Amino acid sequence: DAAKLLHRERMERVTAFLSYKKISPELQRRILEYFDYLWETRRGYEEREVLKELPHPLRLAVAMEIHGDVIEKVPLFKGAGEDFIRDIILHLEPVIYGPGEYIIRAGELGSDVYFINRGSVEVLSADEKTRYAILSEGQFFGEMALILRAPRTATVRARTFCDLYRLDKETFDRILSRYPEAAQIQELAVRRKEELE
Amino acid sequence: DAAKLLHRERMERVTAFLSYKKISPELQRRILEYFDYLWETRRGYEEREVLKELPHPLRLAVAMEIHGDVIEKVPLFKGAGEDFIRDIILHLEPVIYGPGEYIIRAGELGSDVYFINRGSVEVLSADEKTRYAILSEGQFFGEMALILRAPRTATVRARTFCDLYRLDKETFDRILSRYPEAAQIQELAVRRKEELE
Amino acid sequence: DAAKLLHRERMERVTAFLSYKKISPELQRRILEYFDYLWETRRGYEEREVLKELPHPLRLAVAMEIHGDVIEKVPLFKGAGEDFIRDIILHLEPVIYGPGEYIIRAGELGSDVYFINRGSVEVLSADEKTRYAILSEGQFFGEMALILRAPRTATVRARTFCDLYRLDKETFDRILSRYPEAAQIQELAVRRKEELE
Amino acid sequence: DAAKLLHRERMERVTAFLSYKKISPELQRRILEYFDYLWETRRGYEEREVLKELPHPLRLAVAMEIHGDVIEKVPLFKGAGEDFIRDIILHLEPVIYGPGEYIIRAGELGSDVYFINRGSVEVLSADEKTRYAILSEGQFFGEMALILRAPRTATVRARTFCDLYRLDKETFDRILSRYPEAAQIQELAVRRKEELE
Ligand SMILES: Nc1ncnc2c1ncn2[C@@H]1O[C@@H]2COP(=O)(O)O[C@H]2[C@H]1O
Numbered sequence: 207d208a209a210k211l212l213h214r215e216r217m218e219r220v221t222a223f224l225s226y227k228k229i230s231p232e233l234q235r236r237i238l239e240y241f242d243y244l245w246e247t248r249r250g251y252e253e254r255e256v257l258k259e260l261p262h263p264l265r266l267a268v269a270m271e272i273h274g275d276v277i278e279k280v281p282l283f284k285g286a287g288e289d290f291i292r293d294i295i296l297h298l299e300p301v302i303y304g305p306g307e308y309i310i311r312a313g314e315l316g317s318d319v320y321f322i323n324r325g326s327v328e329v330l331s332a333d334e335k336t337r338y339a340i341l342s343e344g345q346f347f348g349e350m351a352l353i354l355r356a357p358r359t360a361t362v363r364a365r366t367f368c369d370l371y372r373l374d375k376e377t378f379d380r381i382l383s384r385y386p387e388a389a390q391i392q393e394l395a396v397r398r399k400e401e402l403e
Numbered sequence: 404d405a406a407k408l409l410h411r412e413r414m415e416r417v418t419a420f421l422s423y424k425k426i427s428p429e430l431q432r433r434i435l436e437y438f439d440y441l442w443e444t445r446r447g448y449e450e451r452e453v454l455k456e457l458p459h460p461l462r463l464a465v466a467m468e469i470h471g472d473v474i475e476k477v478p479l480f481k482g483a484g485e486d487f488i489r490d491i492i493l494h495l496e497p498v499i500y501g502p503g504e505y506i507i508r509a510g511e512l513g514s515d516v517y518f519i520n521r522g523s524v525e526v527l528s529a530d531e532k533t534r535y536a537i538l539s540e541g542q543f544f545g546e547m548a549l550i551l552r553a554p555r556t557a558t559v560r561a562r563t564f565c566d567l568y569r570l571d572k573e574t575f576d577r578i579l580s581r582y583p584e585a586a587q588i589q590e591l592a593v594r595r596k597e598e599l600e
Numbered sequence: 601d602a603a604k605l606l607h608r609e610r611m612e613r614v615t616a617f618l619s620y621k622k623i624s625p626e627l628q629r630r631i632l633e634y635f636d637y638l639w640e641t642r643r644g645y646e647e648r649e650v651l652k653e654l655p656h657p658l659r660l661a662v663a664m665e666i667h668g669d670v671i672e673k674v675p676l677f678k679g680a681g682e683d684f685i686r687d688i689i690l691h692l693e694p695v696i697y698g699p700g701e702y703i704i705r706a707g708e709l710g711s712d713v714y715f716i717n718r719g720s721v722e723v724l725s726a727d728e729k730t731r732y733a734i735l736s737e738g739q740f741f742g743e744m745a746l747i748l749r750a751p752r753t754a755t756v757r758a759r760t761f762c763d764l765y766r767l768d769k770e771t772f773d774r775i776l777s778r779y780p781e782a783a784q785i786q787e788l789a790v791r792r793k794e795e796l797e
Numbered sequence: 798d799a800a801k802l803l804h805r806e807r808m809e810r811v812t813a814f815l816s817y818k819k820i821s822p823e824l825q826r827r828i829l830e831y832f833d834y835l836w837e838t839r840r841g842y843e844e845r846e847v848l849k850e851l852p853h854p855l856r857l858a859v860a861m862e863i864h865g866d867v868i869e870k871v872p873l874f875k876g877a878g879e880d881f882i883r884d885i886i887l888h889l890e891p892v893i894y895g896p897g898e899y900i901i902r903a904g905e906l907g908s909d910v911y912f913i914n915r916g917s918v919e920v921l922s923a924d925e926k927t928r929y930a931i932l933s934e935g936q937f938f939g940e941m942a943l944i945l946r947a948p949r950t951a952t953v954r955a956r957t958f959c960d961l962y963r964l965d966k967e968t969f970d971r972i973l974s975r976y977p978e979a980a981q982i983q984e985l986a987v988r989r990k991e992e993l994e
């Protein structure tokens with residue numbers, strides 16, 4: 207288990223540096239709990255570095271197996287066929303957020319869409335006084351900024367540690383075009399736009 | 404033979420990770436047979452990394468010797484002279500496909516052209532019910548999308564393990580311009596377009 | 601303290617090379633004093649490399665703590681709120697200059713703005729006969745080239761070793777737009793433009 | 798002298814690979830003599846890697862000292878002042894050619910200009926039947942393609958091992974603009990254009 211050692215090693219570097227920079231213990235704690243969640247959910251492997259010298263059609267086969275969980279637990283990504291999956295599975299970037307961390311701020315102009323695989327997030331207004339929803343596994347958000355061609359309509363914060371998949375606006379728009387049910391999503395963006403005014 | 408050890412080492416990393424990600428044995432097997440074909444055809448060397456700090460005119464001399472096999476076994480790349488070779492030999496990127504793997508899908512908009520050095524590939528239709536050809540060493544494909552200014556006219560799958568050379572659309576168009584026999588290829592793209600309708 | 605060893609190691613490489621290239625002792629001395637200031641002010645850590653695999657919202661939290669000193673000692677960056685900080689704190693690049701080194705030359709077309717955290721700099725004319733100011737901790741310069749849409753109005757040299765933060769023109773213009781007090785700065789650029797003619 | 802060992806090490810990798818790829822002994826020999834010239838002229842240091850983490854104004858001071866030889870031995874780069882040097886010294890990229898190697902081919906569209914620091918080169922016509930000149934230390938070539946806004950007017954081959962400095966077209970055009978004597982060069986491009994027809 208030099209992995210576990212390497213893991214605890216490749217964080218004391220950060221830890222030593224941050225101790226030297228005299229950061230607060232609250233922040234320091236957030237760093238540690240991240241690295242713990244990082245270890246327990248990924249076991250020291252780095253999907254990028256380990257799969258880099260793989261040919262594209264193998265990178266594609268691995269992705270459909272190891273990142274299939276997202277695709278099976280999104281209840282409108284069935285009847286979609288393996289062609290739709292094919293164009294999307296390599297453009298799902300896994301990102302990790304911690305509890306309290308902002309993923310989207312309302313007014314922003316991003317168009318990236320996030321698919322939740324683990325954890326739960328808050329959908330809030332600008333003043334953060336209103337909680338429009340709680341989204342979790344098999345759900346997604348950040349889809350409205352493109353369908354409605356509008357800025358981000360709401361703020362999204364993490365409640366827990368979240369395993370998310372980020373989809374770039376470019377891949378997103380290409381999907382809607384080439385794969386119209388792109389309208390059950392649009393029929394979801396609307397009902398959210400409705401319950402927002 | 405730390406090379407052979409390094410080789411078997413720089414794959415157990417992938418193997419351990421994929422075992423942990425709980426991939427299927429069929430996929431796992433495809434990974435292993437790739438790395439075996441990779442070892443036997445390349446012996447652990449990485450042409451990119453080993454030749455990187457070489458000056459351009461040496462990179463050019465090595466390429467004509469070690470990637471000459473392609474150029475000698477393509478029976479319309481003779482009478483082409485060493486000037487035509489010169490502008491093409493560094494833009495032939497070696498890629499590896501496995502049996503069953505799609506290289507080109509019909510309808511796609513790529514313009515990259517592939518030259519076969521080893522193995523054999525299938526030329527299929529969209530429904531894959533029709534097999535227009537079997538191409539192997541000294542043959543090439545993906546040339547029609549540019550000459551005809553059309554999308555990919557057919558699907559190309561590997562039958563075996565294939566050593567291919569990818570040529571970018573940019574280098575391809577520049578070649579046709581500056582080196583017209585660019586027409587025996589065009590007279591090949593036509594006869595294929597004919598036997599396709 | 602292999603750090604201190606590594607540090608003294610990762611400079612003898614430069615030192616050996618420069619000794620071999622037969623550089624002057626004055627220059628050689630400037631190299632050594634830089635590496636000393638580099639060690640004493642940073643203790644061998646490399647903020648880029650150590651924080652690279654951190655998620656964005658953590659990179660953001662660390663930055664506000666460890667690069668907060670700049671933001672607290674700039675007496676017009678209060679009442680600015682944590683939203684203004686948020687969009688700026690990751691676009692402050694720390695750079696080091698040595699005594700005598702030119703940071704800005706008049707006539708140049710850069711728009712980057714520099715915020716001083718440590719040390720002192722000279723504001724000079726083209727002929728360098730005139731010293732318009734001495735700027736130090738909590739002050740900044742290079743702001744006039746954008747507000748006035750003019751080339752650099754003056755030459756800026758370091759008097760001492762300076763810890764500066766560079767802000768790109770792109771982030772700078774975005775700040776002025778979205779955060780108008782952008783006018784107490786403009787009311788500072790003017791009074792400098794006045795006392796310059 | 799692990800340097801000399803590292804040097805002989807970081808070439809047997811190339812040597813082993815090329816032996817395995819079954820290259821010709823003539824080519825193999827050209828590789829060895831390059832690496833020898835590389836060792837004797839650079840002693841295993843890599844100016845890029847060794848100076849990378851240096852601040853710009855130090856990279857600038859070192860360059861004027863270690864790459865000053867070029868600037869002092871070009872007899873029309875005096876009376877040029879340290880401002881002209883300043884904008885050029887970091888845009889001189891050192892490249893190495895071997896005897897027989899083409900640096901420029903006539904008809905080509907490059908605009909890069911080469912300054913000779915060591916060795917000698919041939920200026921030839923397309924048919925290579927004519928030798929317009931022999932250029933060596935303190936001389937330069939490739940300047941006519943930009944001044945005359947024409948393609949390369951002649952072929953340039955190395956006679957010996959040459960230490961050259963490459964200047965990009967972008968830096969070149971900027972120099973001519975901001976530093977007109979840009980005309981003693983133009984008065985050199987003309988006399989060459991004359992003695993060429
Ligand atoms: N009523 C709602 N219920 C659930 N999610 C919502 C609601 N309103 C907005 N959102 C999500 O909040 C997101 C903020 O960014 P977008 O506008 O790109 O996309 C928005 C939706 O994904």
Ligand SMILES: Nc1ncnc2c1ncn2[C@@H]1O[C@@H]2COP(=O)(O)O[C@H]2[C@H]1O
Nearest residue numbers: 535536544545546547548555556557595
């Ligand atoms: N009848 C055919 N015989 C052989 N190869 C073919 C035939 N039809 C199409 N192809 C190849 O299939 C390729 C699919 O992509 P392209 O259109 O770029 O180029 C096409 C040809 O190279």
Ligand SMILES: Nc1ncnc2c1ncn2[C@@H]1O[C@@H]2COP(=O)(O)O[C@H]2[C@H]1O
Nearest residue numbers: 732733741742743744745752753754792
């Ligand atoms: N009178 C002055 N007092 C202080 N700083 C000055 C004065 N004049 C010019 N400067 C600084 O010199 C800088 C040179 O570059 P800029 O024009 O971008 O911005 C200018 C100001 O920051």
Ligand SMILES: Nc1ncnc2c1ncn2[C@@H]1O[C@@H]2COP(=O)(O)O[C@H]2[C@H]1O
Nearest residue numbers: 929930938939940941942949950951989
């Ligand atoms: N008569 C000549 N004497 C010396 N150098 C020459 C002569 N003719 C051409 N050259 C060099 O050959 C070069 C080929 O490329 P360029 O046109 O950019 O610039 C040209 C000159 O530098």
